[PDB]
Ligand binder design. Structure first.
Ligand SMILES: [K+]
Ligand SMILES: [K+]
Lengths: 587, 587
């Protein structure tokens, strides 16, 4: 094998609070940069009136919001945690939900590899003082140190494995995915959480334009444009769940795309100015990634570029990509997502990787925006690359869909990873009509009601989703939380009816109001309560009593319920986090 | 009836390390602003390449230099003290020396009134933490708090009295002089140290030009000029020693000028933009100061203005002064010293007051520089004021020389003080030719040699200085320090010869090496050793043994040595401070 599957994803970007909102924005060519009036910016009093100050930024909505009760975190600790700690932790929870894996029931080793910006931690609060070694000191250290961005995931999700934090400037996301795959291919872990986080402080802030530098003169990012003047600074987060491809296919996971190869290197002594791609070192990086995945440049029909929007930086990157593709490669779609959202720093490579992964999944090519006058110096007809001006269906003459994503940063950091479309979906056996248990749990009743509203809305969106996959994913892919709700249904239409309204019109809901469940009916197993016979697991009354016992707070062995069928994990709505704002008051 | 004499002065400004250098620069119309290359500024990385950044400032040479051993300060404490603490402490030492008063032997109550910029301390180091009450905590507080800028002077100079620190933005010097004079007129103190200190941090730094604001566009300050765009930021220190006029004449002090009146008020609800003078409030301040000293505007022939260099602010200030002078005032010379050095913040009013005092003392009017096109909007021929374009002798038709100095600041702070030339000198009796004792002491032997070189150089410049004044000032105006030197001479030429070379060619020096002084020859007084008879005080051998006893470290009553003659205190060189560099290393 040596291929790594992306079985779950979670991200937040300017103008997008989730991946579905992110993909919909890329499809319609929307811009997520925010423009402010002078009074809306409450910092930079010395610069706000300068003619060179641009009141534009890529804002991250809810950078200060967190739901500590879901993770078991105290309010004091939530304020002590840097925004990058909270945002990445909340995204790791969501990436596990998107893959339908309950961390409490994960039997293998999970690695957490993430990249973070230490400049953000240094601006949020003063660092820990290690003059004493009390427990409150350890709490303050775990809230501030970049080293514990990955450790806190292992602790607060209940996972066991290894945690590694890397700091790689603007290539952070790729370096995390690169290192995560080494862990998987060497067999040290079974699946891996990999990603990056960037929260710029102060958040609501502009920047200062200087002639010839990477920052834009008008606040617009125009990649590959002749009139491009640079990019905008942005914040975001992107996390993916990684798993070896043969194991992901065997376990009937939900696969967005596969990672064929990754490669990293540094410009070293052959250094450039910031944003300038050195042709020899970057091309060696791109070629090494394709060599690692055994993909030929003829087969890559999408190239997601770094693309600041500077004529000189775009020319050096397209030339470096040209050296790696060769002459005989053919034609390839080129684009830069920074035109949509700006430069997201640590996670800038993640926005491009997430764009490429979803492009392979939906077999669609999103456009590159703010492109009106093509850069004549890049001479695109003499290169394999064609700027994606319009959205288009992805139907390559090659026969296979493969994409390459590049991340450039300061300090000479280079990185490139090559993705392939997921395996073709297998032929499914016809769905058996039988009563099934569906479950929803959160911390309080209001959050469960939001889960019911989100699921009924989701059912309208995805009319081709099978009912046996929904129940398998909800029952085996979500953590059992205190406030619980369940129903016993046989069709998709019955599911929509029980979810509607207050949710109490269902068979299980009326059972819980009348009497408590009789536990002598069930057999206790190592994983919880189970039904006494195989014939019992197809009786509506037996399934109804078991679900009510679960709603009452008992632990149920959901594995033995789905042992007879080979269902698939699917992507369902995430937890509806109640987002209170947390910010430190003492420096 | 309430006149206060300026009997000592000390200052440092851009381009001047002492008051003699400052007056000489004003006389020749020199500019003390410094211009830097981009690489010479090691701060403001984000602004250094902006087209609006002006690499100009009024630097204070040696802002980080200090000689803590002379004050009894430890090296640890010298690094803990803010630069404003050290600069003001060193200037207070110099101002007592300039007036020829030894703080150990001052019999009265001395008040120390100063103004400081608390923003500098907040940038130099983190503030003290009061979680405990140990002596090391108190040392850190005394090193950081602005309240102890004045207290440390009382403690380290050996004075007893009262200390008051005020913070009055750009009117700081005037408010200190105002409060000092109230202390004297109410009899709370016998003499007062008054001044201010301004050390801008970071020191070597430019500024950002913004159109229509107070900062200059080219780095030059052009007061009353039609093409003026503002001023430059400057650092400095200015301290004066104040004493009631009748007492200063009775003690034969050296009087630069006298303070006739002072007045303060605030713009209040009648507020303006920064630097803009409200005519009604500022004129009331100017008129109130002249009313306090019982001086009529017809008698004021010099007006030292605030003078930023902006056409609108210069026009409003000249209008306010016109309202206070009336129509029948006559003619008056107007100038603004900010053209020479820039805006010195807390001590900005000090630069003008010191310029006016030396103008009154030397009977000269220094020019206003950078003035090529007069502001037609002010209409100077229709006002009593005439811009002093060239240096000129001060011979007013009024008959008396009086000056008014105005200080404007942010927050609406206004201040104005009126000075008069010193009293006419009395007729001196011819100098008796007799042997006299002259003394020099410092902290180490190398500093004493610098004192001898400084004293011999001074003798060439001031050939009209009487020897009985020189000995009286050296013997009664300097602190007795461990490394000592003395000589017994009768003429100025004998003084020049013994000071020359290694300084060991005198009878006192040859006496100390051969034999020790026999103290039984002398009589003990409450203030030290004295000679047994009046006839002995004219014997060379008796005076030589007494001087040698002092060099060996004994305490000598110098009051009784000069009791028979009425000598005068004169201005002699200051201590040659060995200036080691001190800066904090931990925030
Ligand atoms: K008043
Ligand atoms: K005796």
């Amino acid at each position: 094998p040596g291929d790594v599957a992306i079985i779950g994803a979670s991200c937040r970007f300017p103008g997008a609070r989730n991946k579905e909102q992110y993909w919909d924005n890329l499809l319609h060519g929307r811009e997520g940069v925010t423009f402010y009036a002078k009074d809306e910016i409450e910092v930079d009093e010395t610069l706000i009136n300068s003619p060179a100050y641009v009141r534009a930024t890529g804002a991250l909505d809810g950078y200060d919001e967190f739901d500590p009760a879901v993770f078991g975190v105290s309010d004091r600790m939530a304020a002590a945690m840097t925004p990058e700690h909270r945002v990445f932790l909340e995204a790791s929870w969501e990436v596990m939900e998107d893959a339908s894996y309950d961390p409490e029931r994960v039997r293998g080793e999970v690695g957490v590899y993430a990249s973070t910006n230490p400049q953000s931690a240094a601006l949020y609060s003063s660092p820990p003082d290690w003059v004493s070694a009390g427990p409150e000191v350890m709490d303050r250290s775990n809230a501030w140190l970049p080293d514990t961005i990955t450790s806190n995931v292992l602790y607060y999700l209940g996972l066991t494995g290894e945690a590694v934090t890397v700091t790689a400037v603007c290539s952070g996301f790729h370096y995390a995915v690169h290192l995560a795959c080494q862990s998987l291919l060497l067999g040290q872990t079974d699946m891996a959480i990999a990603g990056g986080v960037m929260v710029r402080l102060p958040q609501r802030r502009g920047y200062l334009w200087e002639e010839g530098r990477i920052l834009s003169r008008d606040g617009h990012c125009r990649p590959f444009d002749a009139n491009g003047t640079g990019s905008v600074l942005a914040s975001g987060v992107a996390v993916v769940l990684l798993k070896p491809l043969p194991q992901a296919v065997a376990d009937r996971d939900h696969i967005y795309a596969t990672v064929k190869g990754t490669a990293i290197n540094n410009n070293g002594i052959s250094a450039m100015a910031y944003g300038l791609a050195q042709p020899e070192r970057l091309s060696a990086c791109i070629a090494g990634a394709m060599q690692a995945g055994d993909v030929a440049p003829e087969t890559v029909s999408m190239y997601e570029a770094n693309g600041f929007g500077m004529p000189i930086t775009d020319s050096l990157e397209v030339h470096a990509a040209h050296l790696a593709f060769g002459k005989q490669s053919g034609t390839c779609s080129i684009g830069a997502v920074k035109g949509n959202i700006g430069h997201a720093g640590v996670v800038a490579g993640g926005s491009g990787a997430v764009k490429a992964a979803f492009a392979l999944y939906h077999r669609s090519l999103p456009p590159t925006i703010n492109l009106t006058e093509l850069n004549e110096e890049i001479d695109f007809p003499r290169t394999p690359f064609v700027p994606q001006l319009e959205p288009a269906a992805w139907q390559p003459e090659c026969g296979i869909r493969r994409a390459g994503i590049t991340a450039l940063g300061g300090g000479g950091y280079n990185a490139h990873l090559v993705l392939e479309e997921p395996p073709r979906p297998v032929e499914r056996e016809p769905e058996n009509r039988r009563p099934r248990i569906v479950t929803l749990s959160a911390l309080d009743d209001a959050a469960v009601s939001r889960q019911r509203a989100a699921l009924s809305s989701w059912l309208a969106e995805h009319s081709d989703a099978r009912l046996d996959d929904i129940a398998y994913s909800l029952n085996l892919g979500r953590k059992a939380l205190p406030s619980r709700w369940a129903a016993v249904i046989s069709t998709r239409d019955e599911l929509l009816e029980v979810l509607s309204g207050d949710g109490k019109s269902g068979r299980v809901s009326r059972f819980g109001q009348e009497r408590r469940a009789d536990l002598a009916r069930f057999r206790r197993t190592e994983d919880g309560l189970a039904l006494g016979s195989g014939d019992e697991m197809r009786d509506v009354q037996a399934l109804t009593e078991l679900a009510a016992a679960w709603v009452q707070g008992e632990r149920v062995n959901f594995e033995v319920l789905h042992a007879d069928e080979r269902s698939h994990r699917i992507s369902l709505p995430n937890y509806p986090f109640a987002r209170r704002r947390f910010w430190r008051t003492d420096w």
